[PDB]
Amino acid sequence: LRGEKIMQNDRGDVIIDRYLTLDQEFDRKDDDMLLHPVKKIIDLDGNIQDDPVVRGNRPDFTMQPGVDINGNSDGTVDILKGMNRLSEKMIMALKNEY
Amino acid sequence: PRKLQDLGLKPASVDPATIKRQKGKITNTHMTGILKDYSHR
Amino acid sequence: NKDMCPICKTDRYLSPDVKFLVNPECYHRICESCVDRIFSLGPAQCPYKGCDKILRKNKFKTQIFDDVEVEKEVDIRKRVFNVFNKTIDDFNGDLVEYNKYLEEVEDIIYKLDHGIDVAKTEEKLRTYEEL
Amino acid sequence: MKFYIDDLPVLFPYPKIYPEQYNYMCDIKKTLDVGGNSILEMPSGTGKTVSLLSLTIAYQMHYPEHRKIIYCSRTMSEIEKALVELENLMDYRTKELGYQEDFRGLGLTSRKNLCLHPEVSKERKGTVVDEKCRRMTNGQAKRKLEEDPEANVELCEYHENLYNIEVEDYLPKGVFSFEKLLKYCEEKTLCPYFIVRRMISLCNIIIYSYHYLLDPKIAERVSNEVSKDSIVIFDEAHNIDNVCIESLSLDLTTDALRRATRGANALDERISEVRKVDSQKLQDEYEKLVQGLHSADILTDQEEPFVETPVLPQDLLTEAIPGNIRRAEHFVSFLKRLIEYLKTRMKVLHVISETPKSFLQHLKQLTFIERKPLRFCSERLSLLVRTLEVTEVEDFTALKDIATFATLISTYEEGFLLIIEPYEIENAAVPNPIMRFTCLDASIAIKPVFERFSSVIITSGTISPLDMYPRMLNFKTVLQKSYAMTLAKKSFLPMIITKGSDQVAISSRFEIRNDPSIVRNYGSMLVEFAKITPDGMVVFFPSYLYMESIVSMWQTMGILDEVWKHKLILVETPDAQETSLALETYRKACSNGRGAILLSVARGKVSEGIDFDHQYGRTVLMIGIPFQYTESRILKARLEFMRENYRIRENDFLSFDAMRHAAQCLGRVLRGKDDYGVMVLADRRFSRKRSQLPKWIAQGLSDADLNLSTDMAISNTKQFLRTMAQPTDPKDQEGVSVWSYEDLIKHQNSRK
Ligand code: SF4
Ligand SMILES: [Zn+2]
């Protein structure tokens, strides 16, 4: 929750870890709580879908999320999304019923 | 392990032979048991 | 039929020096070790279950493409193109005749690959060799 | 206002006008009247789009020729801004001339941006959207429904409702932005995509992206409808070479070929199935192929080829099908053994770079595939798929890649290279071979444009140096110049930071990204600027991987915790929609005074059209020079090609590429002359690139700011922000930076 990369070596606590998978479900429920159509002025999705048949050269590894030797994600994008979600939730909470 | 390594089979062991088993006259002495050795920082 | 000789069951893990070869006659994979012992003395029937087509050790080669069917087509294509071979200039720039000639050659290759009419087609290949 | 050029009356939609805008308009008219191309570089703090539309629209409406206009932007988001400006300009004209003149202006984009079908617009990729729309609009469904009403094939009410009305009555006269276009079409159940595509021949001005002018796949259909005498505007064309190169490039992976064999086998099975029950279709196609017809004469205007033409239309052979691939089974065998050759070429153990000729020669040797049939691969496959009734084409999708590769490598031989690498990612346990077909010359894709159209205007805010674009892209210009903004009081403070407060050098070199001193020095600069920046602060990084690593390092150091107290942290992510949500949040936090900081990539999605003006941008933090990854086979090949052909030194191009992106991000902070912000270039290597910055940015960069420290930059920023918060004296800008009608007339009198 602090936006820190989890270390496998760290023992943690047995009781609280049971809620880790539940949080993975709350984040999904929160991603939809924030998702909504975006104005075309700053819609970055339409720029990549402007020409759906673009086939060029795949970008270098410096222009892609980091991966490990085995090929799976290193996990730094998750904390980037976590802070992104924290800011989005704070701003959305401002526009409450009051 | 050497014989297995000649046939192309990866040997899961090693030859044990490769296991590398790893002043004088002082001035002031009335401070007999006070001076702690802070040699490095 | 994954990485081991179907005859001797010599897996690649225990014999990393294993190397396979194919014979155009039946395109059956076989490791080099079996080739020497079965064919060194002379011609013998293929050591496969259901295959009785004799072959010689001197004919074995290395498979180029990972697909056996394409290997058969390419080798037949090489055999036909060694006989049926012309160019656009051979018909004085007549593209219609050249395209028809190309279609006929493809039909010949298709028939030889799938055995539609082996006897008539094979004779035609032999006949055109004289001309 | 409504002022006059030599004989052209032009109606500006504002009562005031900048001196730069008038000079910009005068130069554009001079280029239009004299004919030819020009490269104009106007600052970002001056209205460029409004000036272009004002003059060009007036030019088309006054002269007898009534030349049309083609407006090319780089992203879809820019088309909206251009259309909004066009609507504002035309509304002013309708109110000053007393009537709405006959005028039509439409934007153009893909189906994904304009699909109103409740079940087809819910897709996450545009290729699927096109497939489903084609299934309901190709005409197969309509013909089957005509013969037998009981058929369950569905249609699109939007597409069908258009047939009732005529093409001239799809939309009312005026300018339609996408926001307005979708609203109008929803109330009448019409397809905006098909309305736009069927009205390009009637538009006075058509606005689309560069991919619809340079990419042969989507360009040929659109290009055939526009006029030949139209005015062509290249807006924000400082990175047009990248678009030109990706149009004739392709990449093949082991997964692609493994998925291609399955499709070829499925295609052979489908042919066998069709052979047994319905064989007249095959003979009918074969008969027309023998005659000499191609896709154009066989396919109806309603249907589209399965494989988009991957080469420029001028390089397609006009002769009949060679005959080898004339029959279905022969073509399938031809296709299968081509795939096998590609697979056996993926087993190399070292990087191999070869010309298309060498690849063709080896192909002709191992197998017996000649060049000419390989050129018809894409054309033939579209016919075979069309005649096979392939209602679901999920299996055959992979074959579009093989066909595209086949038609490219057999067409071009100069300016193209084929790189095969055993490691797409060098940091991998198991090699993953890749095969890249790269375009080295950037002028091959833009050659048709500069010959088809007489007058072309290449304009951008940061297009410098201007000599290199004629060099890189083989075209010549009647005039190329850059304007310097006549700002009464300095409004932007460009600074270069070379070291930290400890005087240790700072750089974004990738090899020292994980350095405790450089990481902490950059983090301290980020925090200190976050303390004095009032509303918004954008930070651009050389690459996404560099940003990911350094941000993670900051988290451990605790630098982020200090930033969180003053501003919200929004980060650019690979997902486009999530980044769009981040932009929405970042703008919201800037407006309500909460303060926000946006971390993005200099060469990413944010930098290619999103503008951070007024409160959305008050400080720009360029963390390092955005260099490419030098150890890239594609870039090294391109650098070698440019050196031998255009005599461009490798270091010169690399610096030019990096600066054109750094300047690109700098210019997205000023909209008018009442806008201000601080531009800091944080890299020791920036200190010698002042002469490489745009003229209007270089003029504002002082000799004392060429190599500053973090503390000295903070002190200057605090003084500058305090100075820009004071009420400006109107007399200081009454007639030197902003012009009324009377001032403009004076400028026309003294000059003459
Ligand atoms: S016709 Fe238009 S609305 Fe209907 S599916 Fe196609 S793109 Fe979507
Ligand atoms: Zn064997």
Ligand SMILES: [Zn+2]
């Ligand atoms: Zn056999």
